[PDB]
Design a protein around this ligand. Structure first.
Ligand SMILES: CC1(n2cnc3cnc4[nH]ccc4c32)CCN(S(C)(=O)=O)CC1
Length: 279
């Protein structure tokens, strides 16, 4: 018997956890005994097969306490992951403000950075780092929860050149990704800076990177939105300091948003910077 082999017949659909354009994740019960006592699992399916197969192979081989656990496959193929009942920071933060203070926020930040630095050391760029993809394991632990856009960087090359970019999360993206479709580890650092802004605003929809940028550049530009975004970033405009966020935290955030990738902070430097603020 293979414990990572999940039979489709026992995999009971409960609800949607999220989706992209081509894939979806659902909460399911794997219930082989049929009595509703089976384990809850997160199941990723296509709504492209080769891409999901690559994602499975990446995730199966990542081992870090801040990276969501692979459980198996169902075979067309589905990825089976651990289900985290507290959900993402998007669900958790708005419901738990009273519980979660700046110190815990900075601990989550460190954990995301550690997860990401592990990923980078395996020569991967993530390309989709955002609060909605950060899972809450407990009040004291988070995990990177999705790897749908994750790509290997070729050895002795510094970046991945993207071809499919229709559904890019532009408001989380560094200027080089917007302008040239080149994706660096430094590009993941930029995205982390935005993700940190979300964490500091408790994922409030009205303070979201999209809502805020569209206020800055104008919401009615259609196909010209990305050029206007790039232009606004060229001018040196950035997301503003979240309420109640100390300038020292905001400055670490700003080093994530240097225009040139070469001048950005790294995940190692962020971890040092946050750990210093904690003790
Ligand atoms: C990470 C995820 N999610 C939300 N709550 C979760 C709870 N447990 C999860 N296990 C794996 C993913 C996962 C969860 C939310 C966002 N998506 S996506 C990229 O399709 O928009 C996947 C599922």
């Amino acid at each position: 018997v293979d414990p990572t082999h999940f039979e489709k017949r026992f995999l009971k659909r409960i609800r949607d956890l999220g989706e992209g354009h081509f894939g979806k994740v659902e909460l399911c019960r794997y219930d082989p005994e049929g009595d509703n006592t089976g384990e809850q699992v997160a199941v990723k399916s296509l709504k492209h097969i080769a891409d999901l197969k690559k994602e499975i192979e990446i995730l199966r081989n990542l081992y870090h306490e801040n990276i969501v656990k692979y459980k198996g496959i169902c075979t067309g193929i589905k990825l089976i992951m651990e289900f985290l009942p507290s959900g993402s920071l998007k669900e958790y933060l708005p419901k738990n403000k009273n519980k979660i203070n700046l110190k815990q926020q900075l601990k989550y930040a460190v954990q995301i950075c550690k997860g990401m630095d592990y990923l980078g050391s395996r020569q991967y760029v993530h390309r989709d780092l955002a609060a909605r993809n950060v899972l809450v394991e407990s009040e004291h632990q988070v995990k990177i929860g999705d790897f749908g856009l994750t790509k290997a960087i070729e050895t002795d090359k510094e970046y991945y050149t993207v071809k499919d970019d229709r559904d890019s999360p532009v408001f989380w993206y560094a200027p080089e990704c917007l302008m040239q479709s080149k994706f660096y580890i430094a590009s993941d650092v930029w995205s982390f800076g935005v993700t940190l802004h979300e964490l500091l605003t408790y994922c409030d929809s009205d303070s979201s990177p999209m809502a805020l940028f569209l206020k800055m550049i104008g919401p009615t530009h259609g196909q010209m939105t990305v050029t206007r975004l790039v232009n606004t970033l060229k001018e040196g405009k950035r997301l503003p300091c979240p309420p109640n966020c100390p300038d020292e935290v905001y400055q670490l955030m700003r080093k994530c948003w240097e225009f040139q990738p070469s001048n950005r902070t790294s995940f190692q430097n962020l971890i040092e910077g946050f750990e210093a603020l904690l003790k």
